[PDB]
């Protein structure tokens, strides 16, 4: 239903709240640390590179509505990993961007959501902040 | 007027400066360094330079006059929490600040802020939401 | 009677001056080579981690007079201790600050006495200067 | 008159010429480094700019006539020592140093140092002894 | 005419631009840096001053017009996949691309560039070939 | 028949290479995970330090016709080397050059031929594209 | 009858050659690794921290006519041991100095020769070229 | 006329110019960087400024009419070699050169230098053989 790649602070965080609302999660990631770190959160926490065309197909990574690639402080597989997706025929895959140059890559390589940790998460801080006066509460 | 004043314009906090501006609401915009201020005079309402530790500087914008301050001071925990410090000093309403790591979440909370914001985390539990919502 | 909290040179060196004039002391710190290299000189040289409100209760530190944050350079623990004993109600907290910034979070936060160890070592030193002139010895 | 002399003002040394400054006391307060000597201009009887391992520069300050110096250099036990070994040549009574760490406390003792301070160290000791007093 | 376009000239992409012209062809090199583009100025028909991730820049330089582009970016991965991936959109007939590790080639494979080159390994394969004649 | 010094993109690419056109190499380099990698392909991978003349003679390295030193990063065991081979009268050495001082000094030491993978690879680049269109294919 | 502390290019060299012409040299160096390279030239390598006033008096080293401080890179211990030896009352020492400021603690503390093995390398050598020409051959 | 010329002012091959002049000989200076050429102009029969590498310069310095040229490069063997095996083609009867370690010292010995100098160690032979003169 939902697979999440890359178990950051941002991916991870995503994993959690996905279990929370009783919502079945493939998460992976290759440092086998963070994958035990969620191993009770997902309802199936793989080791794999994601960039490996193969341990990919080893996921049936295909079978998924919704992937997320959550990889961080490398651009490389980030951007690896979301054009693979991009072949498997991935419905919506949806990534975080490191910095400009990565989203506009992502945005042409294909990706149907860019996620700007901070900056997104600014527009929602905004948005909070106008609701409690306007709609005022 | 007067509702809404950002300290820090870094991708986070000048973020959401604009968003206050394209939503059509006037907001104070600070930063010590001037070439951030320069950056963003075009959406606040004014765009101050000085440094929010300073607690003449913080009487020289009028800050106890904002229902809201929001610090998004980011890799200086040092500045962000003494403002913060500050910003309850003067008995500001609500303040929301974002959070460098654990311990700066931490003190947060004990030092009396409303309101502790986790970019990373927060918009992962932001989009684990979104997923669940389209389907 | 006197909890130390943070044994470097400066905290260390006052659990032995408070040794030597027949005091008890209760010397805590993270790092176990640093508890063990003064547990001949405090009544208790137990090793936790002082930001941790638990372990803090495990050291019944609540029931000490006088807590001392000789914590260096981490502007970080030396702060979340401070606010952590702040809580307990701790009568009578000194602290050591590492620059400026902290000395003024420090002043708000609620501390009983900032030491700043260079400078503090300085007034000392022109006072003792004075001294040998005035009083004339 | 020419009673105190102090030698390199960084937090240490400088805070000790405020100190005898404050309590009405000439000080002669010097520094290579010139904006660290405008620094404490306001403070010092005469703060002068010179090199203190420089031999003649020494001369220039009459430094010969100073009952005390204050040897302050910090992170720079090259020069300290240097100074220091320069300071007992001239026969200086009684000659101060602060010390960087344990080696140069022992040079100290063997250059001829009538008092090696160590910050750090000799305040917690200082406090050992409030808390004692305290109580 | 309009038939060659490098763009990056390092070692490898300069090195190009002036065989290009010592076998009387015409080229047009491209590069951010102007002291880059200034040392070339003799060798290229067209040596200007841009930058090739600038999908505005680009146009400027009518490079759609070529019918062979050659991205010699170097240590910067960011811009030589995102310059290519650009270059695709302009529907350029053959775009070559200088690989810099085994990630950029693999992205490169997908993302549509015709010709992949590792200087160090094909030029390895090029000395074997060369040893295997001389014998 | 053909010694290849120093097993690194450059060196170890040629040495397949001249194995997949059926050519029988010596492969050597002092890192021994680098000889692993190769030993399939040459029909001896060894493992020694070029720059030490004793070594070099463990290898009857004297008995090639062509040598090629493929050394990177170290300018040093690069220029030694070559030096080392042009006393065993070795016919022909080639040598990859590091930067435009090694190129000089390879000149001079009496190099057969300097290879500048970068440079040289353009010069191969400008010639392909050149091909393409004056020969028109 | 000599002792050299610190064997480092200089010091340890200098071992040597006390040796070759048939002499009895204390070695010593608190780097066991640099003690079991010279045992072989030192009528007694021995492994020891001369800053410390204890070691030295276990070396006996107040029964050396010459002690030699080759210290390098730490201006600290080159210091020190100078100092200490100075107490022993040894005839005479002899110190490598590693810069300006060094030299003139040397001097200051009461070095009877200090050496400059750049420098004075320098003066060996226009001498050596100035006899080739002056007293011809 | 013409008989010592000292490539490289550092602190070896600097004070072997000093020495040399302070012996009443003529000597050549040389040294890519000026102000170490500036700092010996007052010692040298000639104060060049050049770069010993470059095969032309080294001409403009008539570099072939010496019988002895000392490379004193140090932390550039890259250089230091280059320059060497230069001299040796302008057929320089006597060529001493400083080597940095042991490759250097190797390559030195196949380049043709006729000797090569290793401050460090050499000069603790030298220092052994006072100490044995001494006693
Ligand atoms: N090729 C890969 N395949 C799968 N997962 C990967 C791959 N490369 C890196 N990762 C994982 O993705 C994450 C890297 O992103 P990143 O380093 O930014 O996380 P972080 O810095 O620790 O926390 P945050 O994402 O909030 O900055 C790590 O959890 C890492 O283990
Ligand atoms: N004492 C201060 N008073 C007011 N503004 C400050 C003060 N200190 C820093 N700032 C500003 O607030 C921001 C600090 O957050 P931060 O350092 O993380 O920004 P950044 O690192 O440049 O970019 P980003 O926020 O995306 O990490 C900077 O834009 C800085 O100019
Ligand atoms: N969270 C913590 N809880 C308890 N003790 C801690 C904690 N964090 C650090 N410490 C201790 O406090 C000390 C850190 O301060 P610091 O590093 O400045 O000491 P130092 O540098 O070695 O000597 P000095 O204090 O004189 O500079 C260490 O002894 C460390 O083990
Ligand atoms: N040779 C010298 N003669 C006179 N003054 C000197 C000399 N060398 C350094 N100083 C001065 O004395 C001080 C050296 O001590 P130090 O380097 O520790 O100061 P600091 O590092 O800038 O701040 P702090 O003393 O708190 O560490 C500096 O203020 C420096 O300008
Ligand atoms: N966005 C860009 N648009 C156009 N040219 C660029 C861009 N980014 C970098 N360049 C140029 O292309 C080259 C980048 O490749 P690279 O960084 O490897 O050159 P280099 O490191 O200076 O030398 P070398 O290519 O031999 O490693 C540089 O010459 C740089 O000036
Ligand atoms: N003295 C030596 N004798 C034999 N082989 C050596 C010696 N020194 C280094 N090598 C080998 O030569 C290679 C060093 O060149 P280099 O470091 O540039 O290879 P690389 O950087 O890993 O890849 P590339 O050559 O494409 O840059 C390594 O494979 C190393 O093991
Ligand atoms: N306290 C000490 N007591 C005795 N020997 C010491 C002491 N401290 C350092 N040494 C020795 O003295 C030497 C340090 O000087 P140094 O590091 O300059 O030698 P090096 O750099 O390896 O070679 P070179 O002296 O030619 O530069 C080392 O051999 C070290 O083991
Ligand atoms: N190609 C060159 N031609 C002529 N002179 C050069 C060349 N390269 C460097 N030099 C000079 O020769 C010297 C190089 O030796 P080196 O780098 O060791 O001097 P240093 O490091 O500044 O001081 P020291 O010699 O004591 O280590 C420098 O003074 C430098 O200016």
Not at 21 to 37: F, P, R, S, Y
Not at 66 to 72: N, R, T
Not at 101 to 110: A, D, S, W
Request: hydrophobic share 45%; net charge negative.
């Amino acid at each position: 239903q939902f697979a999440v790649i890359g178990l950051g602070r941002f991916g991870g965080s995503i994993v959690k709240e996905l279990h929370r609302m009783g919502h079945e999660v493939l998460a992976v990631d290759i440092n086998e640390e963070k994958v035990n770190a969620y191993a009770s959160y997902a309802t199936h926490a793989v080791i794999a590179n994601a960039t490996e065309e193969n341990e990919l197909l080893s996921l049936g990574i295909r079978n998924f509505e919704y992937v997320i690639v959550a990889i961080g402080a490398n651009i490389q597989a980030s951007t690896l990993t979301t054009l693979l997706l991009k072949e498997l025929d991935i419905p919506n895959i949806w990534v975080k961007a490191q910095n400009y140059y990565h989203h506009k890559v992502l945005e042409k390589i294909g990706a149907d959501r860019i996620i700007h940790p901070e900056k997104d998460m600014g527009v929602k801080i905004a948005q909070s902040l106008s609701d409690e006066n306007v709609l005022n509460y």
